[PDB]
């Protein structure tokens, strides 16, 4: 039996229940998972090679831009990426009581049961679909 | 507002000199416990001490939880306050010690000061040049300009299905998002596309504002307990156990503490230690008390308020050891005990009147006297519960206020613990 | 013909038999006795309907078979739809995938509703074999009996045209419907704080209909959802509605569950907790402390007790006649008297069992109306609990 | 400015104040009293530092509040891996007591690994088929193979990028261009941050030491390593993968000098709550070669051992008691109490009068010491409320009247609710 | 790092050629009858004729049961595997107790598997000698043989391999000048990489250039791999190769140690026997030393006295330290040594008497020697006296701290004053019982 | 059902041939087969929500020895609707909707 999907009607604001104002989410640089792209040696190298404040390379706007672009690179950290890489029989079985036989044949011979009544998956039906959730799902 | 059991408690009621008023800020009587509360609240506001414990011990229905909520209100929402219950520690996918440590971490908060700016721009002006350098146009209701971006931003943008005439937000440091339509999608009369549109945003093309996000150490721990997404590691399906089993302290919590200290020294973050209110402490096991009297000794443990309703009894998990307040002598010591005293009939009547004023119920003089009598007969909570159905029946019968007849009828209708036990002998 | 909601024990009751002033009646809405308990049930129901007060609890005490659960089911029915009524037993909290405290605090989530109104535009239409397959803008023959609009659409809309083409804010969705194609439909959805689970992960409505989700994220998705739904309130976005949480045979709870309920009923969104217990002086599970109803005093003081007196001969026979009306059984006055006697002697539920068996025997013997001999032979065939206890003398594999 | 770590319960002790000859002073590093216990702590600390033996356990006994945990924290601060845990931490739902205790034991040991590899780093001038790598002191052209050509495209390497490539074709683009940042006025990518051009020889070999504990079994546990190193990680920890592989590899690295082990300390506070299973496991675990120095603390005398109806000293089996060196503490006296209260007041930035100190010492003698330690800050806050510059007897008396002690609390329990 | 353990002086049972016991028995002293029984059981193990036999090292605490256990283990040598286990390790929250016991039994059993492979390697010089078309058919162009000029460090040797392999050659990037890994029977070609002789310093690439092979082209590499039966069980348990196993969420939970008897026995045993009788492997049953056996639950003993009945079960050395005590998991069921009376009938009890004060002195002296610190006669006598008073293990622990005290005091040898001071700074539990 | 005569492709215009006649079905892409399902000579039977490659068409005379086994051309019409009175329990539907296994989205297969 092929049963139809159970439609789950729900409000649209439900999907927008954990969204926070764009002008309130601060840049959380506390993510220590940066140890998947940086090394301790390269971390130290970056620390020892940070450009100085002068950086001799509209005037006040450009100065503020240079200041903010000098502020961000000062952030540097790493947990471990190098130490991880620096450290490190499929015999044949019958899978049953039969003397000798191809496992494929074993699995193909005995398959009596089929699912009783598997339907498709459930689908929420909020008449409004917020762009954020749809974009994330895509 | 959906008045709750502790709504009238909007503060602790201390004067400028520090003494507790007879009746103010919703609280009545209990001057000694209120003074202790006003001292420990200043202790917390000092932000210098750590791990200091408090115990709001006293008979039942004395307002220990009311005093805890008063402390929480006086402290304000600027500092975290974690209401916790002993039964909550008995988790199925996390060990009790780990749940307790997670609550302790939640009881610590830090404010992140940051000044973020945006670079909203028009997509129709998209004109890359060389994939190595790209330019985007700016057209808002107050000005029009153009910007120059790193090709990485152009990649993150083209990743999204941008279209001519869309509003896109470009942050100066990282990130980008699309808002479809700027008073041009509905103009062409083409039907909807499963998304809602938005007019062009007002204000300058380039905006800057100060940001202050209140985040707690537990949020950082939970965020660092996952791969953060991104590449194929982003695999995430239902039943995902976001509250993972445990997280080591030396290599994960230690790194969080180190980075927080660094950003605080840099002036970007500001720490605001909160409070951990653990109610029904007697429910915790002895193997929980033994770890609790040690974790609160660390240099990072916040202020923890305790409340033991029942008196001396057998400790949980022991079945043989008996200690006062159901807490072992090991944890009992080093915890400042604040004894809460019983209320007098006049104080009970005053609390009943305050509850009636807060909940909107209007009671008469004789009605208030009868309700206070019924309360002191068995307990104040019974009168507090009967107060509402009294006014309900009054409204049903067409009476605005409560009278002796209504209170007597509702008292005879329902029954209390004492009355129930009296008739339960049958 | 045969439906799922067949005739049951508590099916005869279809409401609470009260007047405008909550005055009970002798026989109405399947309710016979328990006048004081019925009035208390009506009072607490009106209180719940008010919704201005939160954090209240009630306990329905009484001997077994005294309408304990009948009054609760009648209150549930009188509450009617549009208000969540989570009915569970004291054994449901004992779950494996989730802790008992988490199971209980989630059951609380199932007892608070929230109404949200969405205003969207839906277009009419009919499928005329549009959007042919393999064999640009294309062509859309939108037409209605009242007025037709033959126009085209973009490429991202011609491939979603297809019997009734009910185009909505989504990317299209499926006699020709009447009326103007443009019609404003205001649909209102009521969820029982499903936001905590519907926004737990990706593909999480799957969990909302599966319970596979383990212990929710404590103090990280329940408080934020509460704050957001509160912000929705007072701003015209959404409004919360308090429900009811009925825990039948609540004495199965342990000291942990009682201690958790002590403070769970002290929150802004705390639903009205109605409970019921048959036990009297009994040790609280997990401890040796003997308390009334197996519930600690610190919680019994937080709730109102509701006693249900036993039924008399009059009420017994009236409930029997109500059950007869519910079922298709018919008997003579002598049979009514005999059944009322047997019920007042042993129990009312056993009397209903006996009358059902007697109707069955009558149908078997080709009879049209049950008689005294039928119920007598039934009682002879089907033994009573007390009757079987007397025959326990046989010592049938004792402990 | 308030930081994560601040004045706490054991922050007044900066270490185990001892002389060169392990002669405990009266009070130097914040710690006072417990001369014999302090000398025992110093002896065991020197033993740990020596690392000549393995599988040694020390039991710190004494009544509650005798400074056992204080001595432990002082030794830890003076002691360099250190792992402090409690009897309830090892109890895990997804990990058996034995597995958690073994994980703690292995995490209590440190291991230093020296790594030396060839590195080539410099600013990229132009690619192609061939690379033109520039540095401050020179520039060089390199021919690119198929693997290098594929890596130059899978990662968007371009001119100005300060690239880095060791052997095994492990290329890295650590940070973006140096000079070109100018024309990127408005927006700057998330990963495209800038760095200074390197100097010196283009190709250079760098020697770095990686410090990791013996708990690296989790790293070699599953296909993905970094993931399990943050949260609980794996729970199985098959005996084979632990002993036959990690121990042998560490031994080979020690032989060839690639790695060196540094045994730490495992402090299990309140060991009395451990089950007989944990003690029986420890009985053998302390016999292994790579076993750290174990320290314990217990306030129990003749008490029942959890999990059984048997009673023994310190609430632990006799089988283990024959394997521990008991270091019992002595209750503090009037002078020691007054001195530790002075130290606590000096650390908490609290000034009190001589009469105030005398009353506080009298209270701490009639009651527990932690009670007086808390009364210190309580009276300090009371004085701040009164706006006084120094805490007087009135403040400590008011606090003593406000906050109750175990003794007075129990005495006032006559109500019995 | 020597990292002296608790008791490492034991190097073997130290039995004479006749099988009797002596004092200086390779580190271990005293325990004549016990060491003789250890010798008998180790001779049994070496015989490898009996299986499923258990022995109990019953004795009061301090008798060195674990000491003699490690002694017999070392005597067995690293050749045969020795899996030490404690009763507490059986309690697992993810896998049942009996399956953990069976996994330990499997670990205790060893198996050496040999593998000889004839492989040819060297710089290739491909060339196809043109040959007349298939003589059975018409005419045209064919290739009857394909000559590969494998050049090794010792010399050059052209191999006239089968022409059908030409597909493999073209499959991999086998160009003139690279090292290939040929297989005698299979014939599959696996290019190792170009020769380092062509690795110009200006060419930037890694893992592509390899040094020339040292030795003759034809190499018969003989390698032996010793893996316990549990290793093969685990290897055949989990899957490998595609099948979307790369998933993280639904697969990262590798601890599926749960095992069934069908796979454990049956096919694995049969393939092991096939490798044995065919000459590909040699079975090596080891020993399973289970100390603190009294800590096991009755559900563990009831499975032990059934697994020991199997022909494949290895030798088990139980070491119970407790006396008459209630069996764990039972309701006040007292049995000797905390072991059910039914299992004690299947184990040989090796009794160990208490050490004589002279034996205490000998143990203290040899432990001091192993530590590397000299002790005077008076200090050694005082150590022996205190070890006679209290538990013996207390004295041995007083060597290192006394040694450090002496070294810090300016003296080398441990004088009586040092041990006297340490006895007051540190004391035992018997004296600590005075609460 | 019927031998696949054409398999040209999202939507796939497949061609099934039977003893009755031939019909070009405008089948949906969700049914697009992943395994061999040869474009021609393959006997396939489909129902609306999975396809079953019954066997290879009766071309046994084309080759003397072929790995594929053959079945005769289906005689029934291509498109046929048959009413099946299937007996199931409510718990079947319950546990099926609990963790469905139908559909074709990748999220389903991963779940
Ligand atoms: N000082 C007070 N003034 C006014 N009302 C009070 C005071 N103390 C307690 N109450 C009321 O009495 C009730 C007792 O509740 P709670 O604090 O939970 O009691 P417990 O002491 O058992 O925690 C509260 O609902 C509160 O409204
Ligand atoms: N006043 C009443 N009116 C109608 N039916 C009743 C009344 N009281 C009891 N009943 C019926 O008698 C039986 C009593 O069982 P119930 O009260 O549900 O037992 P419990 O509450 O202990 O589970 C039920 O079938 C109930 O429907
Ligand atoms: N000799 C000492 N020097 C400094 N502080 C001490 C000393 N003895 C005790 N203390 C103080 O006593 C307080 C509690 O003692 P604690 O360590 O809990 O005793 P125990 O070792 O029994 O756990 C600590 O806050 C510590 O500051
Ligand atoms: N005969 C002996 N010779 C030397 N040392 C011994 C001897 N017997 C026991 N020991 C010492 O006793 C200590 C532990 O003995 P052990 O094998 O653990 O016995 P048990 O397990 O019964 O306590 C070891 O450190 C070892 O040095």
Q: What are phi and psi of B107, to 5 degrees?
A: -70, 0
Record: contact A91-E240, CB cut-off 8 A? no
- At C151 the three-state DSSP class reads strand
Q: Which DSSP letter does residue B251 get?
A: I
* Beta-bridge mates of residue B113: B212
C114 forms beta bridges with C191, C240
Q: Which of D294, B83, D3 is nearest to C263 (CA)?
A: B83
Residue C62 CA, closest ligand 2 atom number: 22
How far apart are alpha carbons D149 and D143 in whole angstroms?
A: 10
What was the structure determination method?
cryo-EM
Structure tokens at D89: 């931490």
> How many alpha carbons lie under 13 Å from residue F6 in its C-beta half-sphere?
12
B353 lines ligand 1 (CB under 6 A): no
Q: Name every chain B residue with its beta carbon within 8 A of the beta carbon of F111.
A: 237-238
CATH 1.10.8.60 fits D333-417, yes or no: yes
Question: Which-ligand-closest: CA of E28?
Answer: 4
CB distance B82 to B303 below 8 Å: no
| Contact at CB, E113 and A90, closer than 8 angstroms | no
- Is B196 within 8 Å of A131 (Cβ atoms)? yes
Q: From the CA of B277, how far away is ligand 3's center (Å)?
A: 26
Which of D196, D214, D230 is the best substitution to test chain A (most A C-beta atoms within 10 A)? D196
Strands (E), D98-176: 109-127, 130-134, 139-144, 162-166, 171-175
Give the residues across from F52 on adjacent strands. F45
Q: For C133, name the nearest residue in chain F, comparing CA atoms only.
A: F26
- Residue listed under structure tokens 């307040």: B325
CA–CA dist D116, D208 (Å, integer): 6
| CB contact at 8 A, E174 and E191 | yes
Chains D and F share 3 or more Cβ pairs within 8 Å: no
Q: What is the DSSP string of D215-257?
A: GGGGTTTSS--TTTTTBS--S---HHIIIIIIIHHHHHHHHHT
Cα–Cα distance for residue pair C76/C55, rounded to 1 Å: 19
In sequence order, which ranges of E229-350 are alpha helices (DSSP H)?
229-237, 261-262, 268-278, 298-307, 341-344
CB E283 within 8 A of CB E276: yes
CB of C316 sitting under 6 A from ligand 2: no
Give me the residues paired with residue B138 across strands: B145
Distance of CA C67 to the CA centre of its chain: 17
Q: Are E228 and E111 in contact (CB under 8 A)?
A: yes
The number of C-beta contacts closer than 8 angstroms across A and F is: 40
| Contact by Cβ (8 Å): C251, C294 | yes
Contact F49 A117 (CB under 8 A): no
Looking at the DSSP assignment, which residues form a beta bridge with residue E25?
Answer: E28
Q: Choose among D48, D63, D342: nearest CA to B329.
A: D63
Resolution of this model in Å is 9.4
Token pair for B312: 């001396």
Query: Domain residue spans in chain D?
Result: 8-109+213-332, 333-417
Q: DSSP string of F4-64?
A: EEE-----EEEEEE-SS-EEEEEE-GGG---S---SSSEEEEEE--EEEEEEE-S-TTT-S
Residue A130 DSSP symbol: -
Burial class (CB in 10 A: 0-12, 13-18, 19+), E71: buried
Whether residue B149 lies within 8 A of chain D, CB to CB, comes out as yes
Is residue C179 a contact partner of residue C146, using CB atoms and an 8 Å limit? yes
* Residues in contact with F4: Cβ distance below 8 Å, sequence separation at least 6, in sequence order: F14, F15, F16, F37, F38, F39, F40, F41, F42, F43, F44
Token duo for residue B119: 């670079």
CA distance F44 to F73: 10
Burial of B423 (0-12, 13-18, 19+ CB in 10 A): exposed
How far apart CA B402 and CA B364 sit, in angstroms, is: 6
| Architecture label for domain C8-112+192-311 | 3-Layer(aba) Sandwich (3.40)
Range 269-308 of E in CB contact (< 8 A) with D: 291-292, 295
Please state, as a whole number, how many other Cβ atoms lie within 10 Å of the Cβ of residue C233. Answer: 15
**First CA to last CA across chain B, in angstroms?**
43
Which chains reach chain B with 3 or more Cβ–Cβ distances below 8 angstroms? Answer: A, C, D, E, F
Beta-carbon count within 10 A of A9 CB: 11
Q: Please give, rounded to a whole number of angstroms, the shortest distance from the CA of B325 to a CA of chain E.
A: 27
Q: Which CATH superfamily is domain E108-235 in?
A: RuvBL1 DNA/RNA binding domain (2.40.50.360)
Count of other CB atoms within 10 angstroms of residue D363: 21
Q: Report the candidate in E289, E235, E285, E265 with the shortest Cα–Cα distance to residue E110.
A: E285
**Closest partner CB to A93 (pick from E113, E227, E263):** E263
Task: Enumerate the β-bridge partners of residue E224.
Answer: E114
SS3 B102: helix
CA distances from C156 to A126, C56, C162 (A): 21, 54, 13
- Centroid of ligand 3 to alpha carbon of D74 (angstroms): 11
Task: Name the residue of C16, C32, C67 to mutate for ligand 2: max ligand atoms within 8 A of Cβ.
Answer: C67
CA atoms within 13 A on the CB side of D139: 9
Asked whether the beta carbons of residue A127 and residue C209 sit closer than 8 angstroms, the reply is no
Q: Which residue is closest to D224 within chain A, CA to CA?
A: A84
What is the rounded distance in angstroms from the CA atom of residue D197 to the CA atom of residue D181? 13
- Superfamily grouping for domain E1-107+236-354: P-loop containing nucleotide triphosphate hydrolases (3.40.50.300)
Instruction: Tell the residue number behind the tokens 């976001």, with chain if given.
Output: B242
| DSSP label of E200 | -
Place of tokens 């009322």: C340
Q: Which of residues 16-45 of F touch C (CB under 8 A)?
A: 24, 26
Q: Distance from the CA of B64 to the center of ligand 1, in angstroms? A: 7
Compute the Cα dihedral for D341, D344, D346, D352 and give only its sign: negative
**Taking CB atoms and an 8 Å limit, are C170 and B192 in contact across chains?**
yes
For residue F58, what are the contacts with CB-CB under 8 A and spacing of at least 6? F70, F71, F72, F73
Does the beta carbon of D127 lie under 8 angstroms from any beta carbon of chain B? Answer: no
Who contacts D21 (Cβ-Cβ below 8 Å, separation ≥6)? E408, E409
Quick one: angle between helices B345-359 and B380-397, nearest 10? 40
Angstrom distance (rounded) from CA D167 to CA C234:
64
Q: Within 10 A of E14 (CB to CB), how many other CB atoms are there?
A: 19
Residue E60, Cβ neighbours under 10 Å: how many?
A: 13
| Residue A97 CB partners (closer than 8 Å, separation 6+) | none
Contact D360, D353 (CB under 8 A): no
What length is written for chain B?
426
Residue B152 gets the label, from left (phi > 0), alpha (psi -120 to 50) or beta, of alpha
Q: Work out the end-to-end distance of chain F between its first and last CA atoms, rounded to an integer number of angstroms.
A: 31
| Interface residue C121 vs chain A (CB under 8 A) | no
Collapsed DSSP state (helix, strand, coil) of residue C45: helix
In the numeric block, which tokens belong to residue B233? 């590691």
F vs A contact (3+ beta-carbon pairs below 8 A): yes
E94 and D236 within 8 Å at the Cβ level: the answer is: yes
Determine C/E contact with 3+ CB pairs under 8 A as the test: no
Instruction: Kindly give the number of the ligand 2 atom that is closest to the alpha carbon of C33.
Output: 1
Of residues E107, E254, E429, nearest to D236 (C-beta)? E254
Rounded to the nearest 10 degrees, what angle do helices B380-397 and B365-377 cross at?
140
Q: Within the 208-267 window of chain B, which residues sit less than 8 Å (CB to CB) from chain F? A: 235, 237-238
Q: Please give the Cα distance from D377 to B46 (Å, whole number).
A: 11
Of F97, F103, F105, the CB nearest to A6: F97
Residues 6+ apart with CB under 8 A from B190: C153, C154, C157
- Determine the CATH number of domain D8-109+213-332: 3.40.50.300
Which residues lie closer than 8 Å to C86 by C-beta, 6 or more apart?
C107, C110, C111, C192, C243, C244, C245, C246, C271
The two counts, helices (H) then strands (E), for chain B are 13, 17
The arrangement of secondary structure in B107-223, i.e. its CATH architecture, is Beta Barrel (2.40)
> Looking at domain B343-426, which of 1.10.10.10, 3.90.1150.10, 1.10.8.60, 1.20.1050.10 is its CATH number?
1.10.8.60
Most E CBs within 10 A among D24, D165, D239, D302, hence the mutation to make, goes to D239
- Cα B269 from Cα B260, distance rounded (Å): 7
D108 alpha carbon to ligand 3 midpoint, in Å?
Answer: 25
Token digits for F98?
Answer: 């609990």
Strands A7-8 and B108-118: unpaired
SS3 label, residue E352: coil
CB contact under 8 A, C301 and B379: yes
Strand stretches in chain C, DSSP E: 57-62, 85-89, 112-122, 183-191, 238-242, 244-248, 272-277, 281-283, 290-292, 303-308
Asked if the Cβ–Cβ distance from C292 to B65 is below 8 Å, we say: no
Would you state the structure tokens that stand for residue E353, as one six-digit string? 């008497």
Beta-carbon neighbour count of residue B417 at 10 Å? 27
> Ligand 2: does its nearest atom lie under 6 Å from the Cβ of C348?
yes
Cβ contact, residue pair A121, F86, below 8 Å: no
| Helix D369-386 with B31-46: angle, nearest 10 deg | 90
Going by CATH, does the domain composed of B1-106+224-342 fall within 3.40.50.300?
yes
Q: Which of C199, C202, C197, C235 is nearest to C216 (CA)?
A: C197
Please say whether the structural domain E355-435 has been given the CATH code 2.60.40.3710.
no
Q: Tell the burial category of B122 from Cβ atoms under 10 Å away from its Cβ (0-12, 13-18, 19+).
A: buried
Tell me the residue ranges of DSSP E strands in E34-128.
54-56, 82-86, 109-123, 126-127
* B61 CA distance to ligand 1 middle (Å): 6
Can you name the residues that pair with E119 across neighbouring β-strands?
E183, E219
Backbone angles phi, psi at B14, to 5 degrees: -90, 145
Q: Pocket around ligand 3: residues whose beta carbon is below 6 Å from it?
A: D 9-10, 12-13, 30-34, 64-70, 299, 332, 340, 343, 369-370, 373
**Residue E183 forms beta bridges with which residues?**
E119
Q: Alpha-carbon distance C203 to E251, whole Å?
A: 19
Residues 6+ apart with CB under 8 A from C364: none
3-class SS of residue B47: coil
Give, for B322, the enclosing helix (H) or strand (E). strand B322-323
CB neighbour burial string for B306-345, b if at least 16 within 10 angstroms, e if fewer: bbbbbbebbbbeeeeeebbbbbbebbbbbbbbbbbbbbee
Which residues are bridge partners to B273 per DSSP? B108
Q: For chain B, what are the domain ranges?
A: 1-106+224-342, 107-223, 343-426
From the CA of E321, give the closest atom in ligand 4: 22
Segment holding A47, helix H or strand E:
helix A40-47
> Quick one: tokens of C149?
């609009």
What's the CATH fold of domain F1-96?
Answer: OB fold (Dihydrolipoamide Acetyltransferase, E2P) (2.40.50)
> Is the backbone of residue A35 left (phi > 0), alpha (psi -120 to 50) or beta?
alpha
Helix/strand/coil percent split, chain A, to 5? 35, 5, 60
Q: Which residue in the set B174, B195, B252 is minimally distant from A131, CB to CB?
A: B195
Ligand 1 close to Cβ of residue B179 (< 6 A)? no
3-class secondary-structure state, position C213: coil
Task: Output the CATH code of domain C312-399.
Answer: 1.10.8.60
Contacting residues for C260 by C-beta, under 8 A, at least 6 apart:
B85, B87, B88, B280, C101, C104, C105
User: Cα angle at D329 between D324 and D335, to 5 degrees?
Assistant: 165
Q: Which atom of ligand 4 is nearest to the CA of D322?
A: 23
Instruction: Tell me whether residues F110 and B238 touch, CB distance under 8 A.
Output: no
* Distance between CA atoms of residues C158 and C150, nearest Å: 13
């Amino acid at each position: 039996y092929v049963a139809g999907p159970l439609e789950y009607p729900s409000a649209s604001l439900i999907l927008k229940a954990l969204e926070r104002d764009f002008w309130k989410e601060a840049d959380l640089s506390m993510f220590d998972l940066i140890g998947l792209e940086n090394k301790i040696t390269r971390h130290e190298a970056e620390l020892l090679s940070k450009k100085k404040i002068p950086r001799k390379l509209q005037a006040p706007v450009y100065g503020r831009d240079l200041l903010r672009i000098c502020a961000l690179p000062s952030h540097g950290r790493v947990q471990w990426r190098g130490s991880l890489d620096g450290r490190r029989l499929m015999l044949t079985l019958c899978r049953c009581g039969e003397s000798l036989q191809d496992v494929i044949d074993r699995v193909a011979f005995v398959i009596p049961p089929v699912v009783a009544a598997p339907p498709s998956l459930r689908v929420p039906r909020p008449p409004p679909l917020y762009s954020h959730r749809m974009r994330i799902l895509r | 507002q959906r008045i709750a059991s502790h709504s009238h408690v909007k503060g602790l009621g201390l004067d400028e000199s520090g003494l507790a008023k007879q009746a103010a800020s919703g609280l009545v009587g209990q001057e000694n416990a209120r003074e202790a509360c006003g001292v420990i609240v200043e202790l917390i506001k000092s932000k210098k001490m750590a791990g200091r414990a408090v115990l709001l011990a006293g008979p039942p229905g004395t307002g220990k939880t009311a005093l805890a909520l008063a402390i929480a209100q006086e402290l304000g929402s600027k500092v975290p306050f974690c209401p916790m219950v002993g039964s909550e520690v008995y988790s199925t996918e996390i060990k009790k010690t780990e749940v307790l440590m997670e609550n302790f971490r939640r009881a610590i908060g830090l404010r992140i000061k940051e000044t973020k700016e945006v670079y909203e721009g028009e997509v129709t002006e998209l004109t890359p040049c060389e994939i190595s350098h790209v330019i985007i146009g700016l057209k808002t209701a107050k000005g029009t300009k153009q910007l120059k971006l790193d090709p990485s931003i152009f990649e993150s943008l083209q990743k999204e299905r941008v279209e001519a005439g869309d509003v896109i937000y470009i942050e100066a440091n990282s990130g980008a998002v699309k808002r479809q339509g700027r008073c041009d999608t509905y103009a062409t009369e083409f039907d909807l596309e499963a998304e809602e549109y938005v007019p062009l945003p007002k204000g300058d093309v380039h905006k800057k504002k100060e940001i202050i996000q209140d985040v707690t150490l537990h949020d950082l721990d939970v965020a660092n307990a996952r791969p953060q997404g991104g590449q194929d590691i982003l695999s995430m399906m239902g039943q995902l156990m976001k509250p993972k089993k445990t997280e080591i302290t030396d290599k994960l919590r230690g790194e969080i503490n180190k980075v927080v200290n660094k950003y605080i020294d840099q002036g970007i973050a500001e720490l605001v230690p909160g409070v951990l209110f653990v109610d029904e402490v007697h429910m915790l096991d002895i193997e929980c008390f033994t770890y609790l009297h040690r974790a609160l000794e660390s240099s990072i443990a916040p202020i923890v308020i305790f409340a033991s309703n029942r008196g001396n009894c057998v400790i949980r998990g022991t079945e043989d050891i008996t200690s006062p307040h159901g807490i072992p002598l090991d944890l009992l010591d080093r915890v400042m005990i604040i004894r809460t005293m019983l209320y007098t009939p006049q104080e009970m009547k005053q609390i009943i009147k305050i509850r009636a004023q807060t909940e909107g119920i209007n009671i008469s003089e004789e009605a208030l006297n009868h309700l206070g009598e019924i309360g002191t007969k068995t307990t104040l909570r019974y009168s507090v519960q009967l107060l509402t159905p009294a006014n309900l029946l009054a409204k049903i019968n067409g009476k605005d206020s409560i009278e002796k007849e209504h209170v007597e009828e509702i008292s005879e209708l329902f029954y209390d613990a004492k009355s129930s036990a009296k008739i339960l002998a049958d | 013909v045969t439906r799922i909601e067949r005739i049951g024990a508590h099916s005869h009751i279809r409401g609470l038999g009260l007047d405008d002033a909550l005055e009970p009646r002798q026989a109405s809405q399947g309710m016979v006795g328990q006048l004081a308990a019925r009035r208390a049930a009506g009072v607490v129901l009106e209180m719940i309907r008010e919704g201005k007060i939160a954090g209240r609890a009630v306990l329905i005490a009484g001997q077994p078979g005294t309408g304990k659960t009948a009054i609760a089911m009648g209150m549930a029915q009188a509450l009617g739809p549009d208000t969540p009524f989570t009915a569970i037993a004291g054994s449901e909290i004992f779950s494996l995938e989730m802790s008992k405290t988490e199971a209980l605090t989630q059951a609380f989530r199932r007892s608070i509703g929230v109404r949200i109104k969405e205003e969207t535009e839906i277009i009419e239409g009919e499928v005329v074999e549009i959007q042919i397959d393999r064999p640009k803008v294309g062509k859309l023959t939108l037409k209605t009996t009242e007025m037709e609009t033959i126009y085209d659409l973009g490429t991202k809309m011609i491939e979603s045209l297809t019997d009734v083409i009910t185009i909505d804010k989504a990317t299209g969705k499926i006699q020709c419907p009447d009326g103007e194609l443009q019609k404003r439909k205001e649909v209102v959805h009521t969820v029982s704080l499903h936001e905590i689970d519907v926004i737990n992960s990706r593909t999480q409505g799957f969990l909302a209909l599966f319970s596979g989700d383990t212990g929710e994220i404590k103090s990280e998705v329940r408080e934020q959802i509460n704050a957001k739904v509160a912000e929705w309130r007072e701003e015209g976005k959404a409004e919360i509605i308090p429900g009811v949480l009925f825990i039948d045979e609540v004495h199965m709870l342990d000291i942990e569950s009682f201690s958790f309920l002590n403070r769970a009923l002290e929150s802004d969104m705390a639903p009205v907790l109605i409970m019921a217990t048959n036990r009297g002086i009994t040790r609280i599970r997990g401890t040796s402390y003997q308390s009334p109803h197996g519930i600690p005093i610190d919680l019994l003081d937080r709730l109102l007790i509701v006693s249900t007196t036993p039924y008399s001969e009059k009420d017994t026979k009236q409930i029997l006649r109500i059950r007869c009306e519910e079922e298709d059984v018919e008997m003579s006055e002598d049979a009514y008297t005999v059944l009322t006697r047997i019920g007042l002697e042993t129990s009312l539920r056993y009397a209903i069992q006996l009358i059902t068996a007697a109707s069955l025997v009558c149908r078997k013997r080709k009879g049209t109306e049950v008689q005294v001999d039928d119920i007598k032979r039934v009682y002879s065939l089907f033994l009573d609990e007390s009757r079987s206890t007397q025959y326990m003398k046989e010592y049938q594999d004792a402990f």
